[PDB]
Amino acid sequence: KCTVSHEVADCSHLKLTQVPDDLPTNITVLNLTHNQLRRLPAANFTRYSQLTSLDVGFNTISKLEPELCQKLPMLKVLNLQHNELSQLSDKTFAFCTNLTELHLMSNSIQKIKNNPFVKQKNLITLDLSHNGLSSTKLGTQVQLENLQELLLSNNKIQALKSEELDIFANSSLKKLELSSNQIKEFSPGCFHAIGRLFGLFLNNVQLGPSLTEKLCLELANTSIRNLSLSNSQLSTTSNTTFLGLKWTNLTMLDLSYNNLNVVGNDSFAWLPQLEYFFLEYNNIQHLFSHSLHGLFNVRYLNLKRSFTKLPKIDDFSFQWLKCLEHLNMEDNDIPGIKSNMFTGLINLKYLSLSNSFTSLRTLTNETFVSLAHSPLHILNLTKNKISKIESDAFSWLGHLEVLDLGLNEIGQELTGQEWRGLENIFEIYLSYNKYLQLTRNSFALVPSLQRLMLRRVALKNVDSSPSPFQPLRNLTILDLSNNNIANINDDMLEGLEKLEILDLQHNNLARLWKHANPGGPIYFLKGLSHLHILNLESNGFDEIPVEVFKDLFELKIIDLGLNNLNTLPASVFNNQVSLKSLNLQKNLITSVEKKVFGPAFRNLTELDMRFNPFDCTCESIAWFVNWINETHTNIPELSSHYLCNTPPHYHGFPVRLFDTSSC
Amino acid sequence: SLEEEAERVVEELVKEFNLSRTQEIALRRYAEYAARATASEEVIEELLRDVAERLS
Ligand SMILES: *[C@@H]1O[C@H](CO)[C@@H](O[C@@H]2O[C@H](CO)[C@@H](O)[C@H](O)[C@H]2NC(C)=O)[C@H](O)[C@H]1NC(C)=O
Ligand SMILES: *[C@@H]1O[C@H](CO)[C@@H](O[C@@H]2O[C@H](CO)[C@@H](O)[C@H](O)[C@H]2NC(C)=O)[C@H](O)[C@H]1NC(C)=O
Ligand SMILES: *[C@@H]1O[C@H](CO)[C@@H](O[C@@H]2O[C@H](CO)[C@@H](O)[C@H](O)[C@H]2NC(C)=O)[C@H](O)[C@H]1NC(C)=O
Ligand SMILES: *[C@@H]1O[C@H](CO)[C@@H](O[C@@H]2O[C@H](CO)[C@@H](O)[C@H](O)[C@H]2NC(C)=O)[C@H](O)[C@H]1NC(C)=O
Ligand SMILES: *[C@@H]1O[C@H](CO)[C@@H](O[C@@H]2O[C@H](CO)[C@@H](O)[C@H](O)[C@H]2NC(C)=O)[C@H](O)[C@H]1NC(C)=O
Ligand SMILES: *[C@@H]1O[C@H](CO)[C@@H](O)[C@H](O)[C@H]1NC(C)=O
Ligand SMILES: *[C@@H]1O[C@H](CO)[C@@H](O)[C@H](O)[C@H]1NC(C)=O
Ligand SMILES: *[C@@H]1O[C@H](CO)[C@@H](O)[C@H](O)[C@H]1NC(C)=O
Ligand SMILES: *[C@@H]1O[C@H](CO)[C@@H](O)[C@H](O)[C@H]1NC(C)=O
Ligand SMILES: *[C@@H]1O[C@H](CO)[C@@H](O)[C@H](O)[C@H]1NC(C)=O
């Protein structure tokens, strides 16, 4: 019948006309979420006298007899979603009160009639989302004594009155939602009738001027804490709007997606207690100094793409945001940083300036001046089209911990004078740059570095100097890919002991692991101890030195593929112990045996010896096919991956199907 | 596509080890490099667990 994991009859999509009637008598979640039923009588349900979470969503029930609840006193949550409970009755559920949550969405109930429900002593949450309701009269007397979070999500309500809410005399509401309903009247007295109306959602309704002005009056002397007017058309603002919200102590607000053009002088000055503040996705074109007056309690600010494509942040326009902690200036055309832009932000901790500027071609010393006194732990700075970092451009940043300078156009010859200061640098994301030639002293001013990402950065001066990476001693990651580095000295990676990743992918080192090169093959993976991952791939090493891998003992990934590599030497993996991966996709290996790949296959958990065409001989793959017999190694699928190709005598055969007994 | 679900793994760590936002970046970078290096699984979990143990 249906999948049954522990006590849930997950008859999700099993087109049924009747009830299951043959599942265990102790199921809890009869999740008939699409099964096209029409009736729920009090005969078939006596088998399920223990059902608790009945979900019959997305199904056509047109009638609910009261007797159905008589046989189900253990039900807690029921989701009558997308049903046809159109014609309601006084006793459609009279003594059916042991619920804890209820939904009646997409039922099209035009009228609530007189009093469908009066007891509901444990109805914490109730939803009536997409019915068609045009009022809020649910009962007559004190009622809903435990309804915490009502949801009138999408109705045709056109007003609000105190008498329509008198049934909420002593009802504690946490979050009340009246979104997506066009309202053009708020009759005097609506929310101080409700005992503890705490939250309120008015998203996506056009309130605007001449309506919000009296709305802030009505909410005055009402215990409302949260509020959200997202997409509620607010073209402008002044000092009279939200005046009445001074007495009622609000804590969170939302003006996102309402196309806010200009902010008035003393607007939002009547909000001493606004903690969060959301002005994202707006068309703001000018930000006066006085505009944010009174916002001394705003902690989180969101200005992702409010400053539409030129805006002019005036001088000292943020001096009143003393308690700001997280700025989000992300998708803007802000034209440069003036000398007094971020003045007063002595509580900032996260800046996130990426895709914000269109003029930061160069970073001079007098460019980050305004953040001299500001704490700043993160400085994103991606996609800012930086051409070249001049000297002492970060002298003002001492608390900075992440310098994520990727996705830029930084083409310059580094010298070391661009990092003066930066005593707390933990990350320098320099990926996706044009060209970065180095010197021996290019990193002597940052010995506190931890993650030097240098992918897709043509990196010169890697061999001529002693080592550009000698000063770095606390480096964990050294990413070098897409650079076409074609020469390395025996001291490129020297002294770096706690390095843990050595990514090297689109590199033409194929020439320097030959045998005919002058001086012998380059032994550059020398001395390292904590190299957990060594991703040497897509290079073309058709040879491996006998004892190149001596130092690597705690190595766990030796991903080495896309390499014309063939005929491995002996004792190549003699000393690697914790080798929990060994990837050789697309090589030229023709022979595998106990010295070539033996000691690697001991505690292995992944093997990728996929596309190398071994000679198909009883001696070429014998220990291999007697090793694939018992595989505690979580080998990938052995079908259509291992194939005989070389000898015409037995060409075209998977290794598992090779008759081992013949040899 | 399925390997993206491994983010929930570190998210569990985010709940399991209530550490700084800066350390979350370090965990994400280590996980991304390991996933781009490792083949399938059962080493990401062990490596990320060891990293989280050696990060707090
Ligand atoms: C609810 O019914 C299921 C279905 O029988 C029970 O699951 C079995 O329980 C017995 C003993 O409890 C085990 O030996 C079986 O292996 C279980 N699975 C089966 C038969 O597929 C479950 O225990 C019942 N739970 C309660 C609380 O009565
Ligand atoms: C909210 O309640 C306050 C009382 O704390 C109201 O303030 C009174 O306003 C009237 C005129 O509107 C004055 O005559 C009183 O002197 C005020 N009371 C004071 C100053 O303690 C306020 O009007 C109420 N908000 C409304 C009705 O929107
Ligand atoms: C809100 O801003 C308006 C400006 O639009 C202020 O109106 C001014 O008030 C001063 C002081 O009473 C008077 O010179 C005039 O009434 C207005 N002057 C101008 C140039 O408009 C108003 O005072 C501010 N405050 C309130 C509560 O409305
Ligand atoms: C930022 O860099 C500029 C460019 O070097 C500095 O301007 C120079 O300052 C010195 C010392 O006052 C003068 O002697 C020079 O004449 C200035 N111009 C040039 C072209 O060198 C400026 O002082 C630096 N700002 C800070 C705060 O150090
Ligand atoms: C700096 O900001 C950029 C842009 O938002 C961040 O790059 C995003 O990284 C997430 C990581 O999952 C991706 O899902 C997004 O697609 C990236 N953005 C874009 C536009 O591609 C970057 O991560 C930020 N820096 C730090 C250190 O978090
Ligand atoms: C019941 O089925 C719905 C339909 O997808 C699902 O969203 C819900 O999680 C299920 N409840 C369970 C499995 O407890
Ligand atoms: C109500 O339901 C709960 C759990 O579903 C149960 O513990 C309680 O005994 C029930 N009470 C009545 C009167 O049905
Ligand atoms: C306001 O909304 C936020 C976001 O969901 C929530 O965390 C907070 O608890 C809400 N305020 C109250 C008083 O419930
Ligand atoms: C003022 O804020 C406090 C903070 O909890 C609140 O208890 C009080 O009801 C508020 N005053 C109102 C809403 O008039
Ligand atoms: C007050 O705000 C208005 C906004 O239009 C601005 O024009 C005016 O200069 C401000 N007053 C100041 C800055 O003293």
Residue numbers in the entry:
A (entry chain A): 27 to 335, 343 to 696
B (entry chain B): 1 to 56
Tell me what the authors wrote about this structure, in their words.
Toll-like Receptor 3 (TLR3) is a pattern recognition receptor that initiates antiviral immune responses upon binding double-stranded RNA (dsRNA). The extracellular domain is responsible for ligand recognition and contains multiple leucine-rich repeats (LRRs) that form a horseshoe-like structure. Here, we use computational protein design to create novel miniproteins that bind to human TLR3 with nanomolar affinities. Cryo-EM structures of two minibinders in complex with TLR3 reveal that they bind the target as designed, although one partially unfolds due to steric competition with a nearby N-linked glycan.
